[PDB]
């Protein structure tokens, strides 16, 4: 058994690959709202989220529950966040995407209604509402894909705060090191061609090279799915 790969080590769940969950502020999700209900809350603070490197808003709701929300750009302390099917479609409000006009920017979008918000959550990203239909509503993802969602899926109106985070180059291994201390990701990473053959499919050889094509089949088993996985194509576009 030429040793297991880094991906298999991470799947094992060892401490080297686990997130420092105790360092994080909140499991960001929409407040739980019953069918045909609404809740209002006011923003009391804007805090740094170590798990995302983007601000989060602390919201005190009418029901006596205090919750951390994924902050949209422009959300300010003292703002009244409304969440409901009848809520005004305004930045920071959590409304169903069936009530959002075409061309509006949404974020923290539920995969299914009441899911808590799955898509469009990183700093600066946003989704655009494209079409409305009777049972489906379509949005353009930050990836460019068109996603057909239930119109009852809730989303906060606006874009995610923290835009331009990666415009500043790391410039230095130490800065990225400090970012990686709060993440599960292993830093730094050794290239596979630099490893021995017992440690990677690409390892070994008198000189550094994979020895086999780096595009691997989608059928390849664990310990073998390395390099370009099921690549449609390779190279820079001609």
């Amino acid at each position: 058994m030429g040793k297991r790969l880094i991906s298999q080590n991470r799947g094992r769940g060892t401490p080297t690959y686990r997130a420092p969950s105790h360092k994080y502020k909140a499991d960001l999700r929409h407040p739980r709202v019953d069918e045909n209900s609404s809740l209002r809350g006011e923003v009391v603070g804007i805090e740094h989220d170590p798990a995302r490197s983007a601000p989060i808003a602390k919201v005190a709701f009418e029901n006596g529950e205090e919750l951390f929300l994924l902050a949209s750009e422009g959300i300010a302390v003292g703002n009244i966040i409304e969440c409901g099917d009848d809520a005004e479609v305004k930045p920071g409000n959590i409304v169903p995407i069936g009530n959002v006009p075409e061309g509006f920017f949404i974020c923290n979008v539920e995969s299914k209604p009441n899911d808590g918000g799955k898509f469009v959550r990183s700093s600066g990203v946003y989704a655009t509402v494209v079409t409305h239909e009777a049972t489906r509503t379509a949005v353009s993802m930050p990836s460019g894909n068109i996603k057909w969602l239930n119109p009852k899926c809730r989303a906060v109106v606006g874009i995610v705060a923290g835009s331009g985070r990666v415009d500043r180059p790391w410039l230095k291994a130490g800065k990225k090191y400090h970012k990686m201390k709060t993440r599960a990701a292993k830093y730094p990473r050794v290239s596979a061609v630099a490893m021995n053959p017992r440690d990677h499919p690409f390892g070994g050889g008198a000189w550094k090279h994979p020895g086999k094509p780096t595009t691997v089949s989608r059928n390849a088993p664990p310990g073998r799915k390395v390099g370009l996985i099921a690549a449609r194509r390779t190279g820079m576009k001609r």
């Binding site: 804007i46 750009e73 700093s123």
Partner: protein, 94 residues
């Protein structure tokens, strides 16, 4: 009013803290980012250039205490302002 901007000194800007490290391209990028982020930013609540970054994406007004979530290095992005202008045009039209 500013530093002794010598005959050659106006290139590194705040990226002079890095010396000859990291290449000219990324030093220029970081220097431009610092210049844009250190600029005065007008408060949307009191309308004076007193908005400073309190954290990564967190901005506060030194006068009125207005704190909000914005860009990482800029209080207001162009996409967010586009959203605001779309909603404002809709509101005006009706």
């Amino acid at each position: 009013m500013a530093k002794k901007f010598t005959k050659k000194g106006r290139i590194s800007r705040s990226a002079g803290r890095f010396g000859p490290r990291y290449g000219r391209k990324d030093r220029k990028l970081v220097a431009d980012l610092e210049e844009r982020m250190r600029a005065p930013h007008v408060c949307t609540k009191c309308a004076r250039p007193t908005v400073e970054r309190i954290g990564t994406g967190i901005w506060k007004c030194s006068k009125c205490g207005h704190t909000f979530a914005g860009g990482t290095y800029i209080p207001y992005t162009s996409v967010g302002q586009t959203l605001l202008r779309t909603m404002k045009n809709i509101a005006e039209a009706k």
